[model samples]
Target: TWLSDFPQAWAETGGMGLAVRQAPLIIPLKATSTPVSIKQYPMSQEARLGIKPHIQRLLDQGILVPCQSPWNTPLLPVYRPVQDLREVNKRVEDIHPTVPNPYNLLSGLPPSHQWYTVLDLKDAFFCLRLHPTSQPLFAFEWRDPEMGISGQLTWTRLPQGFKNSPTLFDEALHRDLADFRIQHPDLILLQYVDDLLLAATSELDCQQGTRALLQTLGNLGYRASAKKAQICQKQVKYLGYLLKEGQR
Candidate 1:
């Protein structure tokens, strides 16, 4: 089949990334025997226990804080009586189009041949906790831990799924890294939430960077997944892009 509908679907949706006809269709064609069962950790629970301690440690070190959102107040629509199908379709079409195969752009970089190191934090997002003092600024839906009051909840700490969690965590980590600017300068450290990528131009630089990061992380009360971290590599997949030396 030529699949003319694929193009029509793409056009109607403006791209594959934005909208989909329905939930992704997964087909289990092969009769594969299951030996190992997939164990899924409850993120909410993990955040509550495993991640909160790490976040608390950071806060104790004066790393993160709950800052207010920069946007203005929300507004309701003035009028919404027209139920036109064409108008709905036009709205979808007018939305931004997504890049097809965006990962392709990550590829073409030249290999550095230099040793690279990769280190990922164990349950990075879950390993963060909101500081009790600044929890008020993160008053979004589920984030309002106090129900608008302090010391009411059974647990003193705020949950992880809060909207401002990432900003607070990122800012705190950044500040800490800024303070410890010794051997960290030569290493390229990329962190997206919890996943970290450390790359260098040479093996010694990579090791030094990795060791420094590990020490810093440990001192900050954060633990890296030792089994998952790679000490030296020509290419490493970070965040979604394959990173290598000389590759842009």
Candidate 2:
């Protein structure tokens, strides 16, 4: 269908250039000497069922790797709130400030009679590589029997559940698509971390914008969630609001 013409964009195979850059992004730690001999959480059936394939996909894409990390954080089940442990100090989150939300940029889009293609990245933070030195900061103990994997696994990519993940991913994606911005002024690219809106006043311009983005994203090794992508739709619901013809 609409995506058939863009195989390169949809390629999820092992090497789709998923690494954000040659130099793995070094996650800045909280400068505390720290996990152990750390607390290990059992792999609940819930997470074991879902997170195995999730981790495998990232592993296939070089976003994660098996590790014998000395430090470990408790692996919460997949259904856990936010996949985070902020309420308790299980891990020290980055103290660095997060990126500003781009909700205001939505206003730049012409809400009246415009065509938009929405692209919601799957596991958005997993697309960029993380440095080895910082991998321990994200180590999670998992014992998914189905995958026959047991041990502390660390993210080679920027993992979600950290305060700085959104900021880091935004910065990397921005840099990756920089040329598209300069070369295609007619295309309006709106991004809130991973939720994206490609806008144009007409279908033709919007199609061009979409194709250009697809190609660029393919090169950058990012993938859209099929359930979330609303490409070339006359109107789309974006960022929790309906973007339709000339009205809120």
Candidate 3:
């Protein structure tokens, strides 16, 4: 199984079963962390201009929908408040709670196979749009508001930092890919948010799966960053797992 290939790869690579810390540069944050509240209007003209088309396409395809939270927690506005470098590091440390490796990618597989592929999504969060009717839920106050801003004073229509956004996006993609999976079960499909991984028994299977995935996503108005997507290869790291055949 594709999921079972990680441990063998890790062992062969001499990995010590340690979790690699994500680089801080890759972390997403609001421009100003000043605790801004969600606004009630549309996004700023500048912000909308860059992503409006993608958002509309998602809605047009019925891939994006409004969802109500049972927890009733208001979506927080993302902001980047000025902070000392030390404080920033401290905050990140606090946010990233340590957990055991549930997937066990490093110490449980064999090491006799060769081949892997990893696919990454570009600008995943920005691809989604907030429903017009639900924009008000994200409004909040900020230290200063730019004049003529169309949206809620400091609010955002889409939840940026909220914990549930990842889960929501993941489910959306899974739903969209359900049909693809049914049509082609010979290929492995693993996804965590927008990142996808496909592992197959042969190069032909991998190539076919990649083509099918891209075609399916395109038909659904979803665009994949081909530059970031890998095709048939000898080794690839996917969702913390190393994939190969006959390996753990």
Candidate 4:
């Protein structure tokens, strides 16, 4: 019933979100940075087969688009395809690490605030669109000799394995949740990047806050994993620690 109530917040129903409230992510390059095109290495038959389905799904979703760019990186085929971004991260200008220390962030919960809810956002970084100018920097060659497909593919959204993804996603979510924070001052909401913990003095408050939170997140074009979400509860795991009665 809870999942059905907020169909837009669940990844299964809502699919991937597109944050229209925020501008597309623009990656600034170092002054001396230049495009580097690293060729894709040979993949074993097993690896090639493994990545085919995953790559096709992304392509179908419009997350991966065919492209021709001076920039290229090798795609490591695993259970899921992963981009080797070591070379790309080096050329990009660094940003301040804005993720908070987990311990300090949890310290705000008071003893009276026992009820809690934890929500893990789905494909957090992928919701943020990559700027057209910077999308080329993440391109990687894709080839399926069996299917006779060969081309360069790049992510339209923020790709995984990038060094700055966590910080960028955190800042973007913080901006998106600014209004939620202002509206619910009574509830202690701790946001650690994509993982969120909402603490309330009572079960009623927690339930109401969580419902409001889910509605807000859905409206903001962010999807939370319904299966992973811990709705209003006395004890829950959040950011690696067990929280209950406001104690870790």
Candidate 5:
């Protein structure tokens, strides 16, 4: 019922989020960079068939678009995981890493904070929009000979395999959560990329804080993993460690 109260906060209900607060990420290319177009190797019949549904879903959601670009990479079909971006990653300028160290974030927890709530954002990278100008750099070739379809497609939203996705998503979410941090000064909120932990002094405070945080996350166009959520608990697992009584 608590989750039903904020439908937009849970991925099962919200589907996918489009962050309205932050600007779309514009990937910068190096001055010496030249367009590199890599063709996808021939795939097995089963592999091509398996990739169809995944490709269709993204295209329907407007995340993937038919693009004509000089830059193309091989998409690992069935892996449904990513485009081969090793060559493209080298062509772009390196961004300063902004993802916080997990130890540093966990160190801020205090002994007085006993109750905790942890939320992992669903499909974190896909929530972030990629700027139009930057979309071409992520293009991948796709073809289905039987369906008589063949072309290049690129992501409108940040793709999972990109080298800078983690850092960019972390920084963007941090900016979006600034207001939440300021409003709840009494609570200890720690964010590591898409993973979030909220610590409070008592059970009642934890319950109230979790509700408020979920509502705010929904309003800001972010979807949390309901299955992975640990709400107002004395002991919770976060960032690969067990946290209880404010001790890791």
Candidate 6:
């Protein structure tokens, strides 16, 4: 409905899903300037057969780009609900830290006054750009899953592997939402990276806050997840908790 009503404002998320900008991110490296022991994961030859639509999707989204680099982090997958986004090789094991959760506002509100909205951002990691210079650090060797043609490629975006991605995204998004706090002081907002929650004392204020928040984030270059968002509500589920009046 939002897209139908505001065609220019809504689009798919990830890759080039957000508005095109000439700007890009340049990652900073400290101490260990050059990545050592650049790793790569190579599947069996049978795996590199076709140009799978999914792989094409990655290329189109700018998540996967063809290039060579001095550093490579193997594409094995998963873990890191915490990270400082360290370099390619050395692991300190102490860089990962958990962030505080912000989902306990229900206790502060009265039963007669309860309105809520949850805005979840999809592909939260891909929302930001990765500097071209740092892009090579994330390079991976991939032979097409379907096509036999193969070459090395890297991510042109803030991909989902590095330990620092969560913290980086969290910090960036928090900075972006700072304006909303000043502009709408009465509106309640709790965020964890891409997951956002908006609350108000009344339906009128709730609707206004919802619209204002969405518009603000959209303008600030963040797209809320269409499937997971629960907008303008008396009851909602957020961060594993079902929220209602007088309870969070």
Worst lDDT 10-window in candidate 6: 76-85
| Candidate 3 Cα deviation (angstroms), residue 101 | 8.1
Q: Which stretches of candidate 4 lie over 4 Å from their true place?
A: none
lDDT of each: 0.41, 0.70, 0.45, 0.91, 0.89, 0.64
Choose 3 or 6, whichever is better by lDDT.
6
- Residues 132-176 of candidate 2 have per-residue lDDT tens digits of 887876776667665576676777777767667787787778888
* 139: Cα error in model 3, Å: 3.0
Write the candidate numbers in order of decreasing TM-score.
Answer: 4, 5, 2, 6, 3, 1
Q: On residues 69-112, what C-alpha lDDT tens digit does candidate 6 reach at each position?
A: 66655443222111113455243123444445554433444565
User: Which 10 consecutive positions of candidate 4 have the poorest summed lDDT?
Assistant: 239-248
> In lDDT terms, how accurate is model 6?
0.64
Question: Listing every candidate in turn, what is its Cα RMSD in Å to the true structure after a full C-alpha superposition?
Answer: 20.8, 3.7, 13.6, 1.0, 1.1, 4.6
Q: For candidate 3, lDDT tens digit of each residue in 1-248?
A: 22232222222222211111111112233454332322324335454444445444534544333333211222222222111123222222133422224264333323422444566665454445544444433333222133342221211223455444565556556767799989987666667676776666677777777667765654553455554556678677665555545444
Where is model 2 poorest over a 10-residue stretch in terms of lDDT?
81-90
TM-score of each: 0.45, 0.80, 0.51, 0.97, 0.97, 0.78
Pairs that collide in candidate 6 are 15-61, 25-131, 49-145, 49-146, 49-147, 50-145, 50-146, 50-147, 51-147, 85-164
The better-scoring model by lDDT among 1 and 5 is 5
The superposed Cα distance between candidate 1 and the true structure at residue 225, in angstroms, equals 1.5
Clashes of each: 3, 0, 21, 0, 0, 10
lDDT string, candidate 5, 9-91, tens digits: 99989877889887888999999999998878888778877888888888999999999999998887644645789999999
Candidate 1 segments whose C-alpha is farther than 4 A from its true place: 1-114, 125-129, 133-158
Measured with C-alpha atoms, the lDDT of residue 22 in candidate 3 is 13
- Give the candidates in order of lDDT, highest first: 4, 5, 2, 6, 3, 1
Poorest lDDT segment (10 consecutive residues) of candidate 1? 74-83
- How far is 2's C-alpha from truth in model 2 (Å)? 2.3
What is residue 219's positional error in candidate 4, in angstroms? 0.7
